C-alpha cells in the first residue's frame, strides 16, 4: 500500500486553520568522506620481485596513473571534510550559564568530562558506527595488518575527530548565542527566546505566539531532543548510510586483496613459488599472466573508487549546503531542512559524516471555519492585510494563517480596493 | 534401520591453521541431516555384511570394551587383489596391505559363557603375496567413536574423534570436528569394505559426497560450526554472504 | 627543476633482509634413484611399473650431470632448480618404448601410445628422462617380450594402467568367446632388433612426477640447513616455502597435524620449523610510503621527510636524514627534518592527524628559517557575550565584493581509436 | 593562484593527454613499441603476435583514458550545473540562501567570463560596528503587552526605543511601531514602559 486513503474536506468557502503546534526535531545523516587509501601498485603486483617489477615496467605508467588517482581521492576526502565543517572563522564558546529561556542543549553541547569533548549524541553516534577490519582511530601502532601488508595503506584524515567535534561545538555555540548573525558577520548576541521569536516570524507566525507559549515550546523541544537520544541509543539502523559507505569500502578492499590468490592461468598464484621452480625464460610467461590479472584487478578497484568518491563528493557538497542554509540560517526551501516549517538546525559530528538535528514547526490541531476572500462593509471591499477572514458561525474575524488567533476585523487589519460587485464570494459584514 | 546425522562427519580439510575466520571449502563431506545406515547384531543369525565404498565413508559406533576391532578395505577380499587390514587387536595398531584368503566369517572367535578372549582366528589364511606393511600407534582405544575414511589420489586419509555421549538409539546432538589421524599412501582403488567384531553390534555407516562447506574457526583454533551450502536456501544464502 | 610548495609522495621504502635462512628436515638416507634407474628389467608400456619414492634426500644434480640420458625434459620445474625444491612425494614410472615415439610422451600429446597405454596429465609437473637401450634390451634374434596396447574402448585417463587381455572387436558384429570375425588381440609385440635404425630401437624411459603444496614435505634437495634467528628481516625458507619477513615465536595453538598457518587474506602468517617442532610467526619487514615536505624551490632547498605509517625506531639511497637530531613521531608517521613546536597556526602544509608543516623562523634567535611541525589551530577562540536581555545591533555596514570561480567546460578532444592503436597499418 | 580552480582542470586534461601519448612508447611485452619496425622485420605469421600485444596494451590505455575523461566530465558537468544555478539565483535575482551568493547578506552578483569557466562578483551587505544594548521581548504600558511590528526593543540605559534588527536607528515606541496581544502576566521578561 502507498499509504492511508485521505479525502480532504474541500469546499469553496471552508478553511482549516491550526489551533496548536508541535515542535518536531528530526535527524538527517549524510556521508561526508570515506577512508583514505593509498595502494603501492608495484608492491601489490610484484611484491619483492625485481624480475616481476622489470616485467611490469613494460606496461608504461599504469602504476603511476593509479597512484595519482588514489592520491586525488584522498586529498578530495580532506577537502570534503574541510568544506563541510570549517564554516566558522572563530571558535565560538557557549557561556558558562545556560540561561536559554528554558531550552536545554545539554545533550548536544560538549561534555568537558569526557577525554573527547564530544556531546552525548555525538558519543552515541560514534559508538553506533562499527567499521569492519581496522581504521588505523585509536591505533597507537602500525595499521590493520592483512590489508596493510600487501602494498595497501590507510592514511589518517587531516582533521582528527577532536577537531571535527571542536568545529561542531563552535557552530552550535554560535547558533544558540547569536542566531544567524555569526554566519553573515560578527556574531551578535541575542537572547534565545528573542531569536526563536525571529524564527517564528520567519515561518510566518507572530512572535507573540512564542512569547505566550514559551514554556510549552521549550518543553516540546526538550522532549524531542530526549526522544532523539533514546532512538539513537536503542535502534541501530539510523546510521545505515555511513555504515553502508564503510562496508562498501571494506568489501572493495577485501576483494582486491583476495584477487591476489587467483592463478589467472599461471601455474601458481605465488610469485616466489613461480620464481623458485622455473628458469628465467619460461617463468616470464607465468609472471606475465599474474601481472595482467593483478593489473586488471587494480584498475577495476581504482575505477570503482573514483566513482564512489564522486558520489561521496556530491553527498559532501549537499552536506555543506545544508550546513550553510540550515545551521547558519533559516531556510524557506520546503523539505530541505527537515519536514515542516524549518526553525533551526543543529550539527552533530559522526564518523565520516554529519548528523543534522532539524528543528521544525508543525501545526497540530486544525478546526473548521467558514471563510471569505473579502468583506463588504460600506460598498467597499476589504481584504486582510496579513491573514485570512474566518467565521465561527455567527461572527467574522481575521486571523493569521498558521495559528488560530481570531481578531476583530478593523480598518487596521484590512485594506480597501474597489467595490463589492467584483470579488467572487464576498460576504457582508461590518468593519470596525 | 536409519538415523539422522545432524551435524556429524566434519573434519579439517587441510593441514593449515586458521583462527577467527570463516573458510569455504569443497571436498567429500557427509551431507547434513541424512540417513546413515545403522546395524545391529542379533545374539542364530549374525549381521555383519560387506558394505560398498565409493568416494569415502563415514563410520561411527558406541564402542564399549573395544568390541570393534578394525576394518577391511578392498575390491574383492578374496586374495585375488590387494586388501587392507586396519586393525588393533591387543598389540599396537597393525596395518597390513597384502592378498588374503578371507574366510566366509572373518571375526575373532569369542565365547560368551569369563571367556572373552579370541579363540577362533578366521580373519584370513595367509598374506600370500603382499606389497607394503605398517605397524605403529601403540595406543589403546557411553563414548562415541567417529571415523572418516577417504581414498583419494593414492592416499588413504583417516580422521577420528573421541567424545563421551549419553544417547542410546540416535546420534548425539552437537558439533565436533574430526582431526586427521594417518595418511597411508597406498595407491589402490576400493569398492567394498567391512568392519570386524568379536563375540551386540552398534555402529553407523555414512557416505561422503562432494559438497561445499562454510567452516567457522574459533578465537583459538578448532572448528566450532559449519554450514552445508547445498542443504537448503537459507544455507545457500549463508554461504553466499560468508556469515 | 622547480617544485612548488607542498608535500609530495615519492618512492616508498622497505627494510631489506639482513641474511637468508633455510630450514630443511635432517633426513639422511639417500634416495634410491640409482636403484630405480638400474632396474634389471623394465616393464612393458601397457604394464608400466610405478615406483613410489619418498622420505629420502633427492640429489638431482648427479642425474642431470650424467650424460647417459639422451632426453631430459622438465615441464613444471627446471632441472637446475630441482636441487632446491621440496616435494611431498615423487613417482618413478619406468618402461621401454619406441625411439621415435619418445616425443609422444610429453603432456597433452596425441598418438597411439599416449592415447592407449600411457597418458600424462595436461598440467603434469615433473621430468621425463629417456635414453637408448638397444644394446641392452634388443636381442640379435629379435626381442619381442615388450607389448603395447593398440585398441581401447575409449581414451584412458592420465596415469591409468590397462592390463586387460580381452579381445577387441572393430565392428558392430558381436565377438563372443576368445575369437570372432574381425576380432583382434589388443596387445601387439615390439619388433626390436639391433639391425633396426634410430627411431625403432628400444628406449628406456623413466618418468619422474611430483606434486607440491598439498602435504608436509618428505623429499628434499641436498641443501645444507643453516641456523635460525628471529626478530630480524630475513629471507626464510621452510621446506621450500621461500619468502621474506621477520620470524617471531608465536603462541598460536597449532594442532599436532597442522604445519602452516594462514590469515584472513589467505597468506602464510605462521610456519612450523621442520627441524624443531615450534610455531614461528611470519611478518613481512616494515614498509611504507615516503613523502617529502618542501616550502617550494622558490623559498628554500631545505626539506622534511615523512615515513608515513612507520615508527621512528625502525628508520632510499640517501641516509643523511637517519642521524636526525630532530626526529618527530606523529600519528601519520615518522617526520624527520622538521622542528616540532608547541604553538599552533593555520595549516600550511597538511601532514595528517591534525599535524601541519610550515616554513618560518621560530629561532632555529631570529632570521634563521626552518621547517616546523605543529598541531593546526582551527581559529581564534571567541566567547559571545551572551546574556538574557542583552542584544548587539550593528550601527554601520560594509559593502563587500568577493569573487567565486567555477569551472564550466573543458577542452574537446577527439581521439581516433584506430589511428591511435594502429596508426597507418 | 586566483584561478587555480580552472588551472587544475586544464592541467588534469593536459596531463591525461600526455600520459595517453606517452603510452604509445611502451612495448607491452612485444619486441618493439614501433609498429613499422615490427612489420618490417617479421613476416605476417610471427609479426601478428607482437602486433596483438601492442593492440592489447594500447586498447587498455585508451580505455583507461576514456573512463577517466568520463568521470572528469561528470564532475565538470556538476560544476557547470552549479554555475548555471548561481547565475540564475544570484545574477538574475536576489538570493536568501545563506552563503550561496557569497559571504554576508546577498545584494547582487555580476558575472565575468573566464577561460573555460565563470567568475561571480558577489556583492553582499556586512554589518560592521555592533553595539550592546539591553533588550526586552515586550513592553508593558497599560496592562497590555506590546510587541514590535518589525524590529526589536532596545535600551540605551534609561530610555526604550524600537529599532530594525540589522541597523541601529532608534525610534520612539508608539502604537504604530508595535501591536498589542494579551496582558502582562504571561510574557517572560516584559518591562514597564510608556507607549506613546
Ligand atoms: C583459547 O585461548 C584461551 C587462552 O589460551 C583459553 O582460555 C583459557 O582457559 C583456561 C581454562 O583453564 C583459563 O584458565 C583459568 O584461569 C583462571 C584464572 O587464573 C582460573 O581461576 C581457572 O581455574 C578455575 O576454572 C577452571 C575451569 O576453567 C577449573 O577447572 C579450575 O578448577 C578452577 O575452578 C582456569 O585455570 C584461562 O584463564 C583462559 N584464558 C583466557 C585469555 O581466557 C581457551 O581455552 C581457548 N578459547 C576458546 C576455545 O574459545
Ligand atoms: C463566535 O464568536 C463570538 C465572539 O464574539 C461569540 O459571541 C460571544 O459569545 C460569548 C459566550 O457566550 C459571550 O460572552 C458572554 O456574553 C454575555 C454578555 O456578554 C458580556 O460580556 C462579554 C465578555 O466577552 C462582552 O464582550 C459583552 O460586550 C458583554 O459585556 C455573558 O452573560 C455570557 O455569560 C458570556 O460569558 C459574548 O458576549 C459573545 N460576544 C458577541 C459580540 O456576541 C459567539 O458565541 C461565537 N459563536 C459560536 C457558534 O461559537
Ligand atoms: C497544545 O499541545 C500541547 C501538547 O502538545 C498541550 O499541552 C498538553 O495539555 C494536556 C492537558 O492540559 C497535558 O496533559 C496533562 O498532563 C499532566 C502531566 O504533566 C497530567 O497530570 C494532567 O492530568 C494532564 O493529563 C499535557 O501534559 C500537556 N503537554 C505539554 C508538553 O505541556 C496544550 O494544552 C495544547 N494547547 C491547546 C490550546 O490546546
Ligand atoms: C537538560 O537535559 C538533561 C538530560 O535530561 C538533564 O540532566 C538530567 O536531569 C535528570 C533529573 O535530574 C536526571 O535524572 C535523574 O536525576 C536524579 C538526580 O538525583 C537521579 O534520580 C538520577 O541521577 C537520574 O539520572 C538525569 O540523569 C540527568 N541526565 C544528565 C546527562 O545529566 C538536565 O538537568 C537538563 N538541563 C537543565 C538546565 O535542566
Ligand atoms: C615505536 O617503538 C617504541 C619502542 O617499541 C614504542 O615505545 C614503546 O617501548 C616499549 C619498550 O621498547 C615497548 O614495549 C614496552 O614493554 C614494557 C614492558 O617491558 C611496557 O611497560 C611498555 O609500556 C611498553 O609496552 C612498546 O611496545 C613501545 N610502544 C609501541 C606502541 O610500540 C613506541 O610507542 C613506538 N611508536 C609507534 C608510533 O609505533
Ligand atoms: C449584502 O449582500 C447581499 C447579498 O447577500 C446583497 O443583497 C442585496 O443587494 C441589493 C443591493 O443593495 C439589494 O436588493 C436589491 O437592491 C435594491 C437596492 O440596491 C433593493 O432596494 C431592492 O430590494 C433590490 O431587491 C439589497 O439591499 C441587498 N440585500 C440586503 C441588504 O439584505 C447586498 O448587496 C448587500 N447589502 C447592501 C448592498 O446593502
Ligand atoms: C560608518 O562606516 C563609514 C566607512 O565605512 C564611515 O564613514 C567614513 O568612511 C571613510 C572611508 O572609509 C573615512 O573617511 C574619513 O575621513 C576623515 C575626514 O577627513 C579622515 O580623518 C579619516 O581618516 C577618514 O579618511 C571614515 O571611515 C569615515 N569618515 C569619518 C569622518 O570618520 C562612518 O564614519 C561610519 N560611522 C557612521 C556612518 O556612523
Ligand atoms: C537615551 O536616549 C534618550 C533620547 O535621546 C536620551 O534622553 C534625551 O537626552 C537628550 C540630551 O541631549 C535630550 O535632548 C536635549 O537635552 C538638552 C539638555 O536639557 C536640551 O538642552 C536640548 O534642547 C535637548 O532637548 C532629550 O530631551 C532626552 N530625551 C528624553 C525622552 O528624555 C537619554 O539621555 C539617553 N540615555 C543614555 C544613557 O544615553
Ligand atoms: C509593570 O507594571 C506593573 C503595574 O505596577 C507592576 O506590577 C505591580 O508592582 C507593585 C509593586 O511591586 C505591586 O504592588 C504590590 O501589591 C501587593 C499586594 O497585592 C503588596 O503586598 C506589595 O507590597 C506591593 O505593594 C502590584 O501588585 C503589581 N501589580 C499591579 C497591577 O500593580 C510591575 O512591577 C511592573 N514591572 C516591573 C519590572 O516593575
Ligand atoms: C470544517 O468544519 C466541518 C466539521 O464537520 C467540516 O466538515 C469536516 O471538515 C474537516 C476537514 O478538515 C473535518 O472536521 C472533517 O473531516 C470534515 N467532515 C467529514 C470529512 O466528514 C467543514 O468542512 C469545515 N467548515 C464548517 C463546518 O464550517
Ligand atoms: C461557493 O459555492 C456556493 C454554491 O455552490 C455559492 O453559493 C451559491 O451562490 C449562488 C449564486 O449567488 C446562489 O444561487 C446559491 O443560492 C448559493 N448557494 C448554493 C448554490 O448552494 C457561493 O457563492 C460560492 N462561494 C465562492 C467563494 O465561490
Ligand atoms: C647402475 O648402478 C651403478 C651403481 O649402483 C650406478 O652408479 C654407477 O656405479 C659404478 C660403480 O661405482 C660406476 O662405475 C658408474 O660410473 C656409475 N654410473 C652412473 C650413471 O653413475 C649407475 O648410476 C646405475 N645406472 C643407472 C641407475 O642408470
Ligand atoms: C534573566 O537573567 C537574570 C539574571 O541572571 C535573572 O534574574 C533572576 O530572576 C529571578 C526571579 O525571576 C531571581 O530569583 C534571581 O535571583 C534573579 N537573578 C539575578 C542575578 O538577579 C532572570 O531570572 C533571568 N530571566 C528573565 C526573564 O529575566
Ligand atoms: C558589550 O558588553 C560589554 C560587557 O559584556 C561582556 O563582559 C564580559 C563578561 C566579557 O564577556 C566581555 O567580552 C563582554 O563584552 C559592555 O562593556 C557593554 O555593555 C557592551 N560594549 C559595547 C561597545 O557595546
Ligand atoms: C532418512 O530417510 C528417510 C526415508 O526413509 C527420510 O526420513 C529422510 O530421507 C531421512 N530422515 C531425516 C530425519 O532426515
Ligand atoms: C577398480 O576396482 C575394480 C575391481 O576391483 C577394477 O575392475 C578396476 O580396474 C579398478 N580401477 C582402476 C583404475 O584400477
Ligand atoms: C595382534 O596382531 C599382531 C600382529 O599380527 C600380533 O603381533 C599380536 O600378537 C596380536 N595380539 C593378539 C592377542 O592376538
Ligand atoms: C591398541 O594397541 C595398544 C598397544 O599398546 C593396546 O594397548 C590396545 O589394547 C589396543 N587397543 C585396541 C582397541 O585394540
Ligand atoms: C604378486 O603376484 C604376482 C603374480 O605371481 C607376482 O608377479 C608378484 O611377484 C607377487 N608379489 C609378491 C611379493 O609375491
Ligand atoms: C636434527 O638435528 C636437530 C638439531 O640440530 C634436531 O632438532 C632434530 O631432532 C634432529 N633429527 C632427529 C633427532 O631425528
Ligand atoms: C617567490 O616568488 C614570489 C614573487 O615572484 C615572491 O614571494 C618571492 O620573491 C619568491 N621567494 C620567496 C617567497 O621566498
Ligand atoms: C612542548 O611541551 C612538552 C611537554 O610539556 C615538552 O616535552 C616539549 O619539550 C615542549 N616543546 C617541544 C618542541 O616539544
Contact yes or no for D29 and A61 at CB 8 A: no
Which residue in the set B15, B179, B221 is minimally distant from C215, CB to CB? Answer: B15
- Taking each helix axis as running N to C, give the angle between helix A62-85 and helix D44-86, from 0 to 180 degrees, rounded to the nearest 10: 10
- For residue A160, CA distances in Å to A1, B75, C31, C332, C358 come to 46, 71, 64, 11, 19
User: What phi and psi, each to the nearest 5 degrees, are found at residue B121?
Assistant: -100, 90
Contact yes or no for C405 and D5 at CB 8 A: yes
- For residue A152, CA distances in Å to A42, A72, A146, C288, C406 come to 11, 16, 9, 9, 34
Helix, strand, coil % in chain D, rounded to nearest 5: 40, 25, 35
Closest residue in chain D to residue A326, using alpha carbons only: D98
Question: Alpha helix locations (H) across A39-191?
Answer: 41-46, 50-56, 62-85, 120-128, 161-178
Count of residues in chain A: 432
Instruction: Tell me the chain A residues in contact with residue D165 when contact means C-beta distances shorter than 8 Å.
Output: 198
DSSP, res C30: B
Tell me the β-bridge partners of A223: none
Angle at the Cα of A398 (from A396 to A404), degrees rounded to 5?
105
User: What phi and psi, each to the nearest 5 degrees, are found at residue A306?
Assistant: -65, -45
Q: Closest ligand to A13 CA?
A: 11
Contact yes or no for D35 and C425 at CB 8 A: yes
Write the CB contacts of D176 (distance below 8 Å, at least 6 apart in sequence).
D149
Please name the residue that has the C-alpha cell 579370541.
B118
Please name the residue that has the C-alpha cell 639422451.
C70
Residue in C292, C268, C259 with CA at minimum distance from that of residue C11: C292
CA distance C415 to D63: 11
Look at residue C172 and give its three-state secondary structure.
coil
From the CA of D82, how far away is ligand 9's center (Å)?
Answer: 60
8 A C-beta contact, residue C78 and residue A286: no
Query: To probe the interface with A, which of C24, C210, C386 has the most A CB atoms within 10 Å?
Result: C386
Instruction: Tell me the chain C residues in contact with residue D126 when contact means C-beta distances shorter than 8 Å.
Output: 397-400
Centre a 10 Å sphere on the Cβ of residue C177 and count the other Cβ atoms it contains.
8
Tell me the β-bridge partners of B156: B151, B184
Tell me the β-bridge partners of B94: B87, B135
Residue in A168, A188, A170, A167 with CA at minimum distance from that of residue A179: A188
Contact yes or no for C390 and A153 at CB 8 A: no
Look at residue C262 and give its three-state secondary structure.
strand
CA distance A374 to A388: 9
8 A C-beta contact, residue A13 and residue A7: no
8 A C-beta contact, residue D160 and residue D173: yes
Tell me the β-bridge partners of C397: D127
All 3 cell numbers of residue D130?
555592533
Q: Are strands A90-93 and D139-140 parallel, antiparallel or unpaired?
A: unpaired
CA distance A309 to A74: 9
* Residue B61 backbone zone (phi > 0: left; psi -120 to 50: alpha; other: beta): beta
All 3 cell numbers of residue A225?
531532543
Residue in A360, A350, A339 with CA at minimum distance from that of residue A84: A350
H/E stretch holding B131 reads: none
Q: Closest ligand to B95 CA?
A: 17
Look at residue A26 and give its three-state secondary structure.
strand
Beta-sheet strand order (sheet of C260-262):
B16-17, C260-262, C268-272, C279-283, C245-249, C233-235, C19-20
CA distance C300 to C368: 12
Which residue in the set C253, C262, C264 is minimally distant from B16, CB to CB? Answer: C262
Tell me the β-bridge partners of C238: C23, C241
All 3 cell numbers of residue A185?
558577520
Q: Are strands D145-148 and D178-180 parallel, antiparallel or unpaired?
A: antiparallel
Give Cα C62 to chain centroid, integer Å. 28
Touch between B and D (at least 3 CB pairs under 8 Å):
no
Helix, strand, coil % in chain A, rounded to nearest 5: 45, 20, 40
Write the CB contacts of A197 (distance below 8 Å, at least 6 apart in sequence).
A207, A210, A211, D137
Experimental structure resolution, Å: 2.5
Q: A6-30 burial, b if ≥16 CB within 10 A, otherwise e?
A: eeeeeeeeebebbeebbbbbbbbbb
Helix, strand, coil % in chain B, rounded to nearest 5: 5, 40, 55
Residue of the CA atom closest to atom 9 of ligand 21: C298
Instruction: Tell me the chain A residues in contact with residue D122 when contact means C-beta distances shorter than 8 Å.
Output: none
8 A C-beta contact, residue A85 and residue A159: yes
Instruction: Tell me the chain A residues in contact with residue D20 when contact means C-beta distances shorter than 8 Å.
Output: none
Helix, strand, coil % in chain C, rounded to nearest 5: 10, 35, 55
Query: To probe the interface with C, which of A80, A190, A253, A324 has the most C CB atoms within 10 Å?
Result: A190
Tell me the β-bridge partners of C304: C293
**Please, which experimental method was used?**
cryo-EM
Beta-sheet strand order (sheet of B57-61):
B10-11, B177-184, B155-164, B143-152, B57-61, B202-205, B37-40
8 A C-beta contact, residue B26 and residue B57: no
User: What phi and psi, each to the nearest 5 degrees, are found at residue A309?
Assistant: -65, -35
CA distance C298 to D167: 48
- Taking each helix axis as running N to C, give the angle between helix D4-22 and helix D44-86, from 0 to 180 degrees, rounded to the nearest 10: 170
CA distance C101 to C86: 31
Contact yes or no for A272 and C85 at CB 8 A: no
Residue in A173, A158, A151 with CA at minimum distance from that of residue A98: A173
CA distance A384 to A395: 16
DSSP, res D88: I
Write the CB contacts of C23 (distance below 8 Å, at least 6 apart in sequence).
C225, C226, C228, C236, C237, C238, C239, C273, C274, C275
Write the CB contacts of C126 (distance below 8 Å, at least 6 apart in sequence).
C74, C75, C76, C77, C91, C207, C208, C209, C210
Which residue in the set B15, B20, B220 is minimally distant from C257, CB to CB? Answer: B15
Question: Does C417 reach chain D within 8 Å, measured CB to CB?
Answer: yes
8 A C-beta contact, residue C7 and residue C287: no
All 3 cell numbers of residue B142?
557411553
Q: What is the largest CA-CA distance in chain C?
A: 130
H/E stretch holding A310 reads: helix A280-322
Amino acid at each position: 500500500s502507498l499509504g492511508a486513503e485521505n479525502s480532504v474536506a474541500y469546499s469553496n468557502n471552508s478553511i482549516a486553520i491550526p489551533t496548536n503546534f508541535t515542535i518536531s526535531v528530526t535527524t538527517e545523516i549524510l556521508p561526508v568522506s570515506m577512508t583514505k587509501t593509498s595502494v603501492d601498485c608495484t608492491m601489490y603486483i610484484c611484491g619483492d620481485s625485481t624480475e616481476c617489477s622489470n616485467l611490469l615496467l613494460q606496461y608504461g605508467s599504469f602504476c603511476t596513473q593509479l597512484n595519482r588517482a588514489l592520491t586525488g581521492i584522498a586529498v578530495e576526502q580532506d577537502k570534503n571534510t574541510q568544506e563541510v565543517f570549517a564554516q566558522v572563522k572563530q571558535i565560538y564558546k557557549t557561556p558558562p550559564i545556560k540561561d536559554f529561556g528554558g531550552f536545554n542543549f545539554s545533550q548536544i553541547l560538549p561534555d568537558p568530562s569526557k577525554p573527547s569533548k564530544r556531546s552525548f549524541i555525538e558519543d552515541l553516534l560514534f559508538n553506533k558506527v562499527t567499521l569492519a577490519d581496522a581504521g588505523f582511530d585509536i591505533a597507537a601502532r602500525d595499521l590493520i595488518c592483512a590489508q596493510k601488508f600487501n602494498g595497501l595503506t590507510v592514511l589518517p584524515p587531516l582533521l582528527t575527530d577532536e577537531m571535527i567535534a571542536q568545529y561542531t561545538s563552535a557552530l552550535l555555540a554560535g547558533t544558540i548565542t547569536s542566531g544567524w548573525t555569526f554566519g553573515a558577520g560578527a556574531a551578535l548576541q541575542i537572547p534565545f527566546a528573542m531569536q526563536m521569536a525571529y524564527r517564528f516570524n520567519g515561518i510566518g507566525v507572530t512572535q507573540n505566539v512564542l512569547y505566550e507559549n514559551q514554556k510549552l515550546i521549550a518543553n516540546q523541544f526538550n522532549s524531542a531532543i530526549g526522544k532523539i537520544q533514546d532512538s539513537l541509543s536503542s535502534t541501530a539502523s539510523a546510521l545505515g548510510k555511513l555504515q553502508d559507505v564503510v562496508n562498501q569500502n571494506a568489501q572493495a578492499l577485501n576483494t582486491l586483496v583476495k584477487q591476489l590468490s587467483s592463478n589467472f592461468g599461471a601455474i601458481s598464484s605465488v610469485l616466489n613459488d613461480i620464481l623458485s621452480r622455473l628458469d628465467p625464460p619460461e617463468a616470464e610467461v607465468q609472471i606475465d599472466r599474474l601481472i595482467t590479472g593483478r593489473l586488471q584487478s587494480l584498475q577495476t578497484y581504482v575505477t570503482q573508487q573514483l566513482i564512489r568518491a564522486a558520489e561521496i563528493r556530491a553527498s559532501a557538497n549537499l552536506a555543506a549546503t545544508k550546513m550553510s542554509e540550515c545551521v547558519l540560517g533559516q531556510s524557506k526551501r520546503v523539505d530541505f531542512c527537515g519536514k515542516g516549517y524549518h526553525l533551526m538546525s543543529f550539527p552533530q559530528s559522526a564518523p565520516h559524516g554529519v548528523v543534522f538535528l532539524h528543528v521544525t514547526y508543525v501545526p497540530a490541531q486544525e478546526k473548521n471555519f467558514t471563510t471569505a476572500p473579502a468583506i463588504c462593509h460600506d460598498g467597499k471591499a476589504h481584504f486582510p492585510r496579513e491573514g485570512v477572514f474566518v467565521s465561527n458561525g455567527t461572527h467574522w474575524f481575521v486571523t493569521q494563517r498558521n495559528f488560530y488567533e481570531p481578531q476583530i476585523i478593523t480598518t487596521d487589519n484590512t485594506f480597501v480596493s474597489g467595490n463589492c460587485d467584483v470579488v467572487i464570494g464576498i460576504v457582508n459584514n461590518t468593519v470596525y | 534401520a536409519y538415523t539422522n546425522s545432524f551435524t556429524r562427519g566434519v573434519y579439517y580439510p587441510d593441514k593449515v591453521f586458521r583462527s577467527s575466520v570463516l573458510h569455504s571449502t569443497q571436498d567429500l563431506f557427509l551431507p547434513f541431516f541424512s540417513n546413515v545406515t545403522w546395524f545391529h547384531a542379533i545374539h542364530k543369525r549374525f549381521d555383519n555384511p560387506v558394505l560398498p565404498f565409493n568416494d569415502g565413508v563415514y563410520f561411527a559406533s558406541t564402542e564399549k570394551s573395544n568390541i570393534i576391532r578394525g576394518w577391511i578395505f578392498g575390491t574383492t577380499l578374496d586374495s585375488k587383489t590387494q586388501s587392507l587390514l586396519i586393525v588393533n587387536n591387543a598389540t599396537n595398531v597393525v596395518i597390513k596391505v597384502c592378498e588374503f584368503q578371507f574366510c566366509n566369517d572373518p571375526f575373532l572367535g569369542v565365547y560368551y559363557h569369563k571367556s572373552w578372549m579370541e579363540s577362533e582366528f578366521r580373519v584370513y589364511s595367509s598374506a600370500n603375496n603382499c606389497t607394503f606393511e605398517y605397524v605403529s600407534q601403540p595406543f589403546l582405544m557411553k563414548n562415541l567413536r567417529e571415523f572418516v575414511f577417504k581414498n583419494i589420489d593414492g592416499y588413504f586419509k583417516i580422521y577420528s574423534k573421541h567424545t563421551p555421549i549419553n544417547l542410546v538409539r540416535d546420534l548425539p546432538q552437537g558439533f565436533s570436528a574430526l582431526e586427521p589421524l594417518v595418511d597411508l599412501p597406498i595407491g589402490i582403488n576400493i569398492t567394498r569394505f567391512q568392519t570386524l567384531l568379536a563375540l551386540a553390534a552398534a555402529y553407523y555407516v555414512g557416505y561422503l559426497q562432494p559438497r561445499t562447506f562454510l567452516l567457522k574457526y574459533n578465537e583459538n583454533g578448532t572448528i566450532t560450526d559449519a554450514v552445508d551450502c547445498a542443504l537448503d536456501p537459507l544455507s545457500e544464502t549463508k554461504c553466499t554472504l560468508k556469515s | 627543476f622547480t617544485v612548488e610548495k607542498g608535500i609530495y609522495q615519492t618512492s616508498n621504502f622497505r627494510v631489506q633482509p639482513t641474511e637468508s635462512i633455510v630450514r630443511f628436515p635432517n633426513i639422511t638416507n639417500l634416495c634410491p634413484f640409482g636403484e630405480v634407474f638400474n632396474a634389471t628389467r623394465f616393464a612393458s608400456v601397457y604394464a608400466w611399473n610405478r615406483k613410489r619414492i619418498s622420505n629420502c634426500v633427492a640429489d638431482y644434480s648427479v642425474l642431470y650431470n650424467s650424460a647417459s640420458f639422451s632426453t631430459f625434459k622438465c615441464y613444471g620445474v627446471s632441472p637446475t632448480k630441482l636441487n632446491d625444491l621440496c616435494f611431498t612425494n615423487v613417482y618413478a614410472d619406468s618402461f621401454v618404448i619406441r625411439g621415435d615415439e619418445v616425443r609422444q610422451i610429453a603432456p597433452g600429446q596425441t598418438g597411439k601410445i599416449a592415447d592407449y597405454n600411457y597418458k600424462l596429465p595436461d598440467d603434469f609437473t615433473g621430468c621425463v628422462i629417456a635414453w637408448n637401450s638397444n644394446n641392452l634390451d634388443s636381442k640379435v634374434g629379435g626381442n619381442y617380450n615388450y607389448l603395447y596396447r593398440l585398441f581401447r574402448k575409449s581414451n584412458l585417463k592420465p596415469f591409468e594402467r590397462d592390463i586387460s587381455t580381452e579381445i577387441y572387436q572393430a565392428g558392430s558384429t558381436p565377438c563372443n568367446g576368445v575369437e570372432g570375425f574381425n576380432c583382434y588381440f589388443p596387445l601387439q609385440s615390439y619388433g626390436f632388433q639391433p639391425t633396426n635404425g634410430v627411431g625403432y630401437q628400444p628406449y628406456r624411459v623413466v618418468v619422474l612426477s611430483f606434486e607440491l603444496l598439498h602435504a608436509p614435505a618428505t623429499v628434499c634437495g641436498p641443501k645444507k640447513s643453516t641456523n635460525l634467528v628471529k626478530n630480524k628481516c630475513v629471507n626464510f625458507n621452510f621446506n621450500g616455502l621461500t619468502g621474506t619477513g621477520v620470524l617471531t615465536e608465536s603462541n598460536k595453538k597449532f594442532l599436532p597435524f597442522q604445519q602452516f598457518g594462514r590469515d584472513i587474506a589467505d597468506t602464510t602468517d605462521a610456519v612450523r620449523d621442520p627441524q624443531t617442532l615450534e610455531i614461528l610467526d611470519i611478518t613481512p619487514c616494515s614498509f611504507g610510503g615516503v613523502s617529502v615536505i618542501t616550502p617550494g624551490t622558490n623559498t628554500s632547498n631545505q626539506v622534511a621527510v615523512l615515513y608515513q605509517g612507520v615508527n621512528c625506531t625502525e628508520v632510499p639511497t640517501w641516509r643523511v636524514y637517519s642521524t636526525g637530531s630532530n626526529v618527530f613521531q606523529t600519528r601519520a608517521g615518522c617526520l624527520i627534518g622538521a622542528e616540532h613546536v608547541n604553538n599552533s597556526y593555520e595549516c600550511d602544509i597538511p601532514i595528517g592527524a591534525g599535524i601541519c608543516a610550515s616554513y618560518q623562523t621560530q629561532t632555529n634567535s631570529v632570521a634563521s628559517q626552518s621547517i616546523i611541525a605543529y598541531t593546526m589551530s582551527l581559529g581564534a577562540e571567541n566567547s559571545v557575550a551572551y546574556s538574557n536581555n542583552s542584544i548587539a545591533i550593528p550601527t554601520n555596514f560594509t559593502i563587500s565584493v568577493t569573487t567565486e570561480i567555477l569551472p564550466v567546460s573543458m577542452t574537446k578532444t577527439s581521439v581516433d581509436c584506430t589511428m591511435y592503436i594502429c596508426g597507418d597499418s
